[PDB]
Amino acid sequence: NVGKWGPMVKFPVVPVAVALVPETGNLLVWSSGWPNRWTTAGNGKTYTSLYNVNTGNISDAIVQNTQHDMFCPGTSLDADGRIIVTGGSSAAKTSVLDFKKGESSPWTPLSNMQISRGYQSSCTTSEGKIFVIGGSFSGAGTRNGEVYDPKANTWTKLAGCPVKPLVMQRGMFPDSHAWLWSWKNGSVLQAGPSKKMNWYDTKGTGSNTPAGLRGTDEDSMCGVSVMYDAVAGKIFTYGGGKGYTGYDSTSNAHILTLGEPGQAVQVQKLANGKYNRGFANAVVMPDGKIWVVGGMQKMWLFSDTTPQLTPELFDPATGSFTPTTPHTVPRNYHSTALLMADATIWSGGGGLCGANCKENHFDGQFWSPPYLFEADGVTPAKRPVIQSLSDTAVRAGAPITITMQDAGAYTFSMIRVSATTHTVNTDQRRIPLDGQDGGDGKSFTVNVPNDYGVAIPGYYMLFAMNEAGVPCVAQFFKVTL
Numbered sequence: 314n315v316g317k318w319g320p321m322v323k324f325p326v327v328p329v330a331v332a333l334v335p336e337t338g339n340l341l342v343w344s345s346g347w348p349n350r351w352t353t354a355g356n357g358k359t360y361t362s363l364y365n366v367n368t369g370n371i372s373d374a375i376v377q378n379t380q381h382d383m384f385c386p387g388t389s390l391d392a393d394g395r396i397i398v399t400g401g402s403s404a405a406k407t408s409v410l411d412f413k414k415g416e417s418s419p420w421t422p423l424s425n426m427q428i429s430r431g432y433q434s435s436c437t438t439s440e441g442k443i444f445v446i447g448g449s450f451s452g453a454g455t456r457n458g459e460v461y462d463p464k465a466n467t468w469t470k471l472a473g474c475p476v477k478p479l480v481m482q483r484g485m486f487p488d489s490h491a492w493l494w495s496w497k498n499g500s501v502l503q504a505g506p507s508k509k510m511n512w513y514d515t516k517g518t519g520s521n522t523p524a525g526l527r528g529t530d531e532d533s534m535c536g537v538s539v540m541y542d543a544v545a546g547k548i549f550t551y552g553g554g555k556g557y558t559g560y561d562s563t564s565n566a567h568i569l570t571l572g573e574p575g576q577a578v579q580v581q582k583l584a585n586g587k588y589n590r591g592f593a594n595a596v597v598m599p600d601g602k603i604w605v606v607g608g609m610q611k612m613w614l615f616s617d618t619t620p621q622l623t624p625e626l627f628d629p630a631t632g633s634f635t636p637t638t639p640h641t642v643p644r645n646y647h648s649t650a651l652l653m654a655d656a657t658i659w660s661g662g663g664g665l666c667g668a669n670c671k672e673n674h675f676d677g678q679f680w681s682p683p684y685l686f687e688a689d690g691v692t693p694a695k696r697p698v699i700q701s702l703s704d705t706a707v708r709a710g711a712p713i714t715i716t717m718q719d720a721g722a723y724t725f726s727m728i729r730v731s732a733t734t735h736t737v738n739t740d741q742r743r744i745p746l747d748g749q750d751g752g753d754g755k756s757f758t759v760n761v762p763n764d765y766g767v768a769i770p771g772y773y774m775l776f777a778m779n780e781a782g783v784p785c786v787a788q789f790f791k792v793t794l
């Protein structure tokens with residue numbers, strides 16, 4: 314039992330960026346101002362397409378954003394499940410999609426950023442603000458840190474949050490794709506890709522302080538990281554290279570353990586993965602395993618060379634990797650992967666290099682992990698069902714009563730609804746939840762962690778896993794301020 318690939322789909326745009334839409338769980342994908350190519354200046358618009366998980370069908374490409382070419386942006390989901398995309402080819406702009414108004418309805422404008430930028434990272438802070446830093450694909454000026462207040466609809470520079478301490482030594486865009494992880498009291502850990510990690514404080518006029526080196530790791534551009542147990546403060550990191558392009562990626566794997574902001578982050582070095590990867594994606598699953606898919610060995614853009622076609626499942630409880638079933642198409646630069654509400658995992662994309670470019674990959678597939686199958690690894694297991702939640706918009710600390718269709722012993726986790734492009738996914742985090750049996754083996758009460766630095770505001774998927782480890786299809790709910 315190594316899981317199983319689902320059937321292949323082929324979008325009418327190259328799915329370079331993708332987002333899970335709250336409530337439905339549909340998968341929204343976008344490229345740029347063209348379906349199949351990009352430019353630095355962009356086309357003043359974006360093509361998007363949407364996979365519907367209720368029907369299994371894909372809709373044809375539309376120009377859904379008519380003011381902003383959202384190639385190479387920052388992405389974050391805010392406290393209400395709005396997808397906020399910054400910069401990129403239209404390097405000054407902020408756009409927003411509110412799913413409630415229609416998954417295919419026009420993206421609408423928000424305030425321009427103070428500093429124009431592209432290939433920055435964006436994250437939603439414990440206050441529900443949006444912090445960006447870096448990003449020199451486009452724009453101008455030192456790409457210092459700024460913060461978006463979505464109540465005020467303003468962007469403010471944070472003099473105390475310079476980019477300098479995160480910049481790597483070599484290669485293109487050394488200030489870009491920071492591994493940003495929101496934490497307690499408005500803090501953000503930049504965990505990489507520079508071997509030097511740094512705390513940022515997004516309150517006030519800003520502050521920053523070293524968080525320590527990432528053990529013995531080297532600079533790791535377009536390595537991956539994921540916060541697989543926010544309650545324990547754990548982040549898994551893998552791979553990357555000394556520069557954006559030009560060098561061999563690594564199979565280095567670490568676990569970071571966060572304590573208090575401004576303190577030193579603990580780093581443990583694991584056994585290496587079997588495959589070295591740059592431009593991979595990492596996805597945390599409801600059981601706390603991490604799936605690492607794609608990437609290449611010697612890093613170049615728009616290239617299918619030295620592809621790693623065999624993904625790996627990492628289990629933090631064993632500190633070990635296991636290979637899963639190979640795919641046939643490379644998933645290198647501009648590839649994406651994302652957890653779906655049915656606990657399968659999207660993988661696809663790659664390329665975006667013009668008409669008749671053989672490195673364009675419009676396609677992808679959904680990977681069903683081992684937990685969806687019986688011990689023979691081929692028969693689909695029966696799945697539990699959440700009938701209801703007591704509440705769907707709860708505060709930090711607040712209880713939620715979860716009513717299962719069938720009586721039994723269940724475990725729970727909530728995974729933050731997320732989006733990804735260019736290896737960057739700041740939105741994804743897992744919180745394991747202790748469930749209190751309510752008497753009947755059917756109603757269970759959990760509490761949201763009491764800290765908004767752990768339970769970052771916004772939408773989550775609540776999964777219940779039965780005694781076999783088989784997860785249900787998630788319910789959505791939000792954590793409010």
Ligand SMILES: *[C@@H]1O[C@H](CO)[C@@H](O)[C@H](O)[C@H]1NC(C)=O
Pocket residue numbers: 368369370
């Ligand atoms: C897609 O749409 C068709 C009708 O065009 C519908 O019959 C079908 O059930 C939907 N899903 C799949 C997976 O074909």
Ligand SMILES: *[C@@H]1O[C@H](CO)[C@@H](O)[C@H](O)[C@H]1NC(C)=O
Pocket residue numbers: 498514516517
């Ligand atoms: C939050 O951070 C600020 C620094 O901006 C600090 O003044 C305060 O001590 C922190 N609050 C808590 C509850 O730790």
Ligand SMILES: [Cu+]
Pocket residue numbers: 385647735
């Ligand atoms: Cu790119």
